[model samples]
Target: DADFMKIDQATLFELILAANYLNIKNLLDLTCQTVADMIKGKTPEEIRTTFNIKNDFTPEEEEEVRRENQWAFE
Candidate 1:
């Protein structure tokens, strides 16, 4: 039951995607919430690093996303 806690962020993301793809509501909800919590104190750069997400946006595009979710940055 507690095994989920031992998973690393990469695996957690994989689980999140897989659970969402399979339409597993319970698993998706839990994984999503867990991820949201983990990103609470992270900066945009940190989040990208944490998730291994590529920085595909240009400076202007990045600024727009940051502006849109400005609160999340705070």
Candidate 2:
């Protein structure tokens, strides 16, 4: 990419803002996908801890989520 964007937090926020202001759809899309890829394999516990989730879901609810997206566990 001639427009190789910065990959830091501040730079990433600025990247999204600039892309939005300029209506750069590809840039926005790639940036979002890039961010998603960065987090594609984290554990549920990691995500919950990162977002300060209180594990409010019951065992059955958690199991349901797990069953619905078993790929996350494997």
Best by TM-score: 1
Backbone Cα, N, C clashes tallied per candidate: 0, 0
> Residue 50 deviation, candidate 2, in Å?
5.9
Check candidate 1 and list the clashing pairs.
none
Error at 18, model 1, angstroms:
3.8
- Residues 1-74, candidate 2: write the lDDT tens digits: 63675457557767878888999888898877765665678887887664456878989998987788876754
Give candidate 2 regions above 4 Å deviation: 48-56, 70-74
Instruction: Report the alpha-carbon TM-score of model 1 versus the true structure.
Output: 0.60
Every candidate's lDDT: 0.82, 0.73
In angstroms, the error of model 1 at 61 is: 2.6
Error of 1 at 23 (Å): 4.2
Task: Return the number of clashes found in candidate 1.
Answer: 0
Over the stretch 1-74, how does candidate 1's per-residue lDDT look in tens digits? 45655687678889988898899998888888888888899977899987778889999997887788877843
